[PDB]
Design a protein around this ligand. Structure first.
Ligand SMILES: OC[C@H]1O[C@@H]2O[C@H]3[C@H](O)[C@@H](O)[C@@H](O[C@H]4[C@H](O)[C@@H](O)[C@@H](O[C@H]5[C@H](O)[C@@H](O)[C@@H](O[C@H]6[C@H](O)[C@@H](O)[C@@H](O[C@H]7[C@H](O)[C@@H](O)[C@@H](O[C@H]8[C@H](O)[C@@H](O)[C@@H](O[C@H]1[C@H](O)[C@H]2O)O[C@@H]8CO)O[C@@H]7CO)O[C@@H]6CO)O[C@@H]5CO)O[C@@H]4CO)O[C@@H]3CO
Ligand SMILES: OC[C@H]1O[C@@H]2O[C@H]3[C@H](O)[C@@H](O)[C@@H](O[C@H]4[C@H](O)[C@@H](O)[C@@H](O[C@H]5[C@H](O)[C@@H](O)[C@@H](O[C@H]6[C@H](O)[C@@H](O)[C@@H](O[C@H]7[C@H](O)[C@@H](O)[C@@H](O[C@H]8[C@H](O)[C@@H](O)[C@@H](O[C@H]1[C@H](O)[C@H]2O)O[C@@H]8CO)O[C@@H]7CO)O[C@@H]6CO)O[C@@H]5CO)O[C@@H]4CO)O[C@@H]3CO
Lengths: 588, 588
């Protein structure tokens, strides 16, 4: 029984509080290295006969990547506090893993041997807005969406052409447009929209922001905005704006003032500047986004900058009653700042969803003191890799997913922002090579996977385009020109997720086979509710055997409707090329 | 090459900023499973040819416990950002470890694959006061040290037998006393006293706290303290106090109130009470320390308490200028409180040492937003295990030591509070079975290890006594009944640590052999200063071999002065049973 692979710490994804009463303890072991494993536990002060009184329940296997197996244990400390150790019987061997080491028998003279989860506090608890767990997001890069009132800038008219429209010049979008095609959304079934930056700024993309307190005229005015939110909410649609706090635009008052005066400027400390005769020759002598001079890094550490932002952050939550902030390049800001940020925001509107943009691992932020969630990129990479480019197998895929899933605490996932693409990556279609078939499978997986899914304005009606700035083509409002089949597909799937909690709140369970390198089958569960998903990611007709739960009564096809009685041990499911099917199991 | 054992995550002890411009990256791998390992790094936005421009430097093995070896990479990231990966070689096998997985060749099409340490913000940087690293702590339990002005309570005056007195009832210790024996301390060499709780409370010990704003009379008064404090500083001695916040006393005003009113009392929320007919029958129906009725837990979540306690914390820092708070049962309070706590305090007096009392793994609190350090109880467990009880071998010791050490970020250990005993643990001497020899070995080890050591009043003159309240015998001031040899021993060892930088803030390195069970040989290094310690943990004269570095010119005995030319491969050192020797290796 290899020990180099047995691991647990009482922190982050291994030990945490799920709710204000239940603790979650995850243990890591090698793949099939250990048969069973029990959670040995008890309240830290429950002593008797000079020996620590303790009881022991058993942990279940909740999945495994390509190396480890993961064990979960759900427990409620009688007296809000607990000490704990692990007991793993693998074959004839029997170990007891403790913070102090491995012992052939459970020490009982002292608690010191065991890991400890002090007090389960409700305040330290991690709780993200319960609603995002049920919404379906739709991102709409304002500029290229719909032209309502022509309070637009002077240049190019809708659809430059069939291919390649878009260099780095405007088409004239605007908030009004969104308000107008607001019926479209409500029909597609979405419940939340996320607008990319919209504050007074020089580009078609509002990231090189100029004034955070003013909405870009080319988009609208306070009136226009509060109306968009009114209509939205009115229909049950939430709104999340884009918070660009890591850096500011070149036209930002204070930064401009820094050149007007140099070392003199009353705003030097608002940025990070080394050399003062600001020269951008080889490259900026001050910290800028990547190396983009026209985008200097703010100084979230400075006292003022902090209050400038903090006010902004709250300004819109109070002035327009928005529903959340997409924090841009969030990972490049001091956690302290985010701590104050969350406090300011959450003190005004608890329900404000605080989504951050972090590409890599985000444990450091999702401790419950900073972000509500983060863009689940590691997931996207996988989905595309599997369905689009067909690089990894179904198991490799299943593995990569199990792995990420287990690197955060349970609830951290339930609020994750799962997207497949955005305004920075190649349109979902083109990445599939125009094989809509694939695109539908991507939507399926994503719309039938717990988290908080988001759709990029063009993808549902089959919009094609390469990388930036191609993914940003003007939304197609020509009935004839948009793929209604893809649209109906997403529509029904969205409404499907809408009435099958399992699909949006349950846990995944891959019944993977290291043999069916192209057959992927997983099931979502929530109490009684169980939905089975089968996918033949093959270019040939396949026959995939599906495990029918013994306890099943009925078996319904969420697509076809046909509802037949389950009966055999298994159900060989026949599917066409790149085909799929959703089955809802029963109980009686 | 076992992958189940390799591990790293960008966070905690694995990836942290050491200082303003330095990052430490640790890699975990199986013991001896890997020959070499190179840190593959580079800036996130550094590009050319569409290929990410990254470079490589090699990591050094910083030691290993029982199951893993450990690697450290000290990198100075320019522009402060970094995306990085590891490259571990072996018997021809060459693997590339990235957050995204294992590859036989470092990917270069996109940084997404690599681990990431975003920005190296200064404000999030962990910085515990600096002096604590350069001090040795003497801890005194007020009620049993020295008796000055007898404003003492009415009870037994001084001892009876050599170990008889002490049941759970007074003797007359008081602050004046501490003052009247400074010379003793000043002479011993200690430079910081940490004294048990001294606030109005009806108990020989003062955790039963009844008023956090008044010095229990029996010890003295406001004026007395200002003196102790005024004088200590004068002598170069710092003062730390015991903050008892996890719970209050039974005679605590606010709790008293709640006793006669219950559902009424303005203070109903100040604590934790389920059923309101407040009863201490089979056991409290309200949250209390362990199950100690007269010690109810506080609500550090409640707005008033928080303001109350935060003021207490600040009070004794303004009015008496103390240098450090000892936070008792700290692990049972919600981190948020410890964050506000740290701010209030540090804001008033940066040098305030905020030491928490956490037994188990204290990572969650050592992120830099809460405690400055914690009681190194894991290392105390090892020491005793090895020297006194003599269970584990020199290897098992050297391992546990490497394990606890590698589980925190370097600068966290530097400020760790290294104690060997308290008023809760049995006296070394008795734990050594009365073998003063072992004892001196403990002191030797303790005063040779990096951290901030703390001697327990009495242990220097070799007092005796087992568990509570044995370890609380009145202090022996009779020159006749106090081991002058031990005192004089600890004294020159302290004076040694004070003059050999390596001994106090350097790195440890065990050269112990696996077949060795009684010979402990280790070196403390810091720059060109190198101190070698040889310990014969055997009741029998021994000959231990000690390697000498090539460059070594001299080799000086620290407690003999004897100095001799290096010139040799090894130096067989002969020691008497339970012997020890400190060598300073001068080298041109
Ligand atoms: O304010 C409370 C307390 O806080 C501090 O104590 C901390 C200490 O600094 C840490 O080192 C640590 O201790 C852990 C301990 O070392 C472990 O061994 C384990 O302890 C278990 C015991 O081994 C086990 O035997 C049993 O304990 C039973 C006792 O044996 C039994 O006698 C009785 O307990 C009575 C005490 O013995 C008695 O002294 C008295 O306690 C009061 C103290 O005398 C007084 O100084 C003060 O305590 C401080 C302490 O000084 C700080 O250093 O308040 C005490 C409260 O009255 O009365 C007790 C009456 O019940 O019953 C116990 C079973 O309940 O069980 C323990 C289980 O914990 O784990 C320890 C936890 O880490 O942590 C402590 C804070 O917990
Ligand atoms: O003004 C600059 C920029 O502003 C806007 O950009 C913002 C963007 O819209 C936001 O979404 C966010 O960006 C975050 C993004 O959401 C995350 O997904 C992520 O990005 C990672 C990349 O996805 C990943 O591929 C890798 O990227 C590396 C590339 O692979 C590598 O080829 C190279 O990049 C070069 C580009 O390929 C090249 O085209 C060129 O890029 C320029 C754009 O074409 C140009 O339009 C403009 O960008 C605007 C953008 O359009 C606005 O919407 O300037 C770009 C720079 O010249 O040059 C690149 C070399 O610099 O290098 C990258 C890595 O350096 O890793 C990344 C990081 O994980 O994180 C994004 C935040 O980092 O914020 C931006 C900025 O506000």
């Amino acid at each position: 029984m290899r020990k180099e692979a047995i691991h647990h710490r009482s922190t982050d994804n291994f030990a945490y509080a799920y709710d204000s009463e239940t603790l979650h303890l995850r243990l890591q072991t090698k793949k099939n290295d250990v048969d069973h494993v029990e959670l040995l536990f008890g309240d830290p002060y429950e002593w008797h006969d000079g020996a620590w009184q303790f009881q022991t329940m058993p942990m279940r296997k909740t999945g495994s990547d390509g190396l480890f197996d993961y064990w979960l244990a759900e427990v409620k400390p009688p007296y809000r506090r607990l000490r704990y150790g692990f007991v793993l019987r693998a074959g004839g061997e029997k170990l007891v893993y403790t913070e102090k080491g491995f012992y052939h028998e459970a020490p009982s003279d002292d608690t010191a041997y065991y890991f400890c989860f002090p007090f389960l506090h409700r305040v330290d608890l991690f709780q993200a807005p319960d609603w995002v767990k049920d919404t379906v997001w739709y991102q709409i890069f304002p500029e290229r969406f719909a032209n309502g009132n022509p309070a637009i800038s002077p240049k190019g008219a809708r659809p430059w052409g069939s291919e390649d429209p878009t260099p780095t010049s405007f088409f004239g979008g605007d908030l009004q447009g969104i308000i107008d095609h607001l019926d479209y959304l409500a029909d597609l079934g979405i419940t939340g929209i996320y607008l990319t930056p919209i504050f007074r700024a020089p580009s078609n993309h509002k990231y090189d922001t100029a004034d955070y307190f003013e909405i870009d005229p080319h988009f609208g005015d306070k009136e226009t905005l509060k109306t968009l939110v009114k209509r939205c909410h009115e229909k049950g649609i939430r709104v999340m704006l884009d918070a660009v706090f890591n850096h500011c635009g070149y036209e930002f008052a204070p930064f401009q003032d820094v050149l007007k005066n140099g070392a003199a400027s009353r705003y030097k400390d608002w940025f990070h500047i080394r050399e003062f005769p600001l020269q951008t020759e080889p490259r900026p002598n001050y910290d800028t986004f990547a190396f983009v001079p026209h985008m200097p890094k703010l100084n979230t550490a400075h006292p003022e900058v902090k209050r400038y932002l903090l006010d902004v952050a709250t300004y819109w939550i109070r002035e327009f009653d928005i529903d959340g902030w997409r924090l841009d390049v969030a990972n490049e800001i001091d956690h302290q700042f985010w701590r104050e940020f969350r406090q300011a925001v959450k003190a005004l509107k608890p329900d404000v969803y605080i989504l951050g943009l972090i590409w890599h691992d985000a444990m450091p932020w999702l401790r419950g003191d900073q972000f509500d969630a983060v863009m689940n990129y590691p997931l996207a990479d996988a989905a595309l890799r599997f369905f689009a480019k067909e690089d990894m197998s179904a198991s490799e895929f299943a593995d990569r997913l199990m792995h990420v899933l287990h690197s955060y605490p349970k609830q951290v996932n339930e609020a994750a922002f799962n997207l497949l693409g955005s305004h920075d990556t190649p349109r979902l279609l083109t990445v599939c090579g125009g094989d809509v078939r694939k695109v539908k499978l991507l939507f399926l997986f994503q719309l039938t996977f717990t988290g908080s899914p988001c759709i990029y304005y063009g993808d549902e009606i089959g919009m094609t385009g390469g990388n930036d700035p191609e993914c940003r083509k003007c939304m197609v409002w020509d009935p004839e020109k948009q793929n209604k089949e893809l649209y109906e597909h997403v529509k029904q799937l969205i409404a499907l997720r809408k009435q099958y909690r399992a699909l949006r709140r349950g846990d995944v369970a891959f019944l993977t086979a290291d043999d069916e390198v192209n057959h992927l089958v997983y099931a979502k569960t929530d109490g009684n509710e169980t939905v089975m998903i089968i996918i033949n990611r093959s270019n040939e007709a396949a026959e995939i055997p599906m495990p029918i739960d013994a306890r099943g009564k009925w078996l319904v096809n969420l697509l076809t409707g046909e509802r037949f009685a389950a009966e055999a041990e298994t159900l060989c499911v026949s599917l066409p090329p790149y085909g799929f099917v959703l089955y809802a199991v029963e109980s009686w």
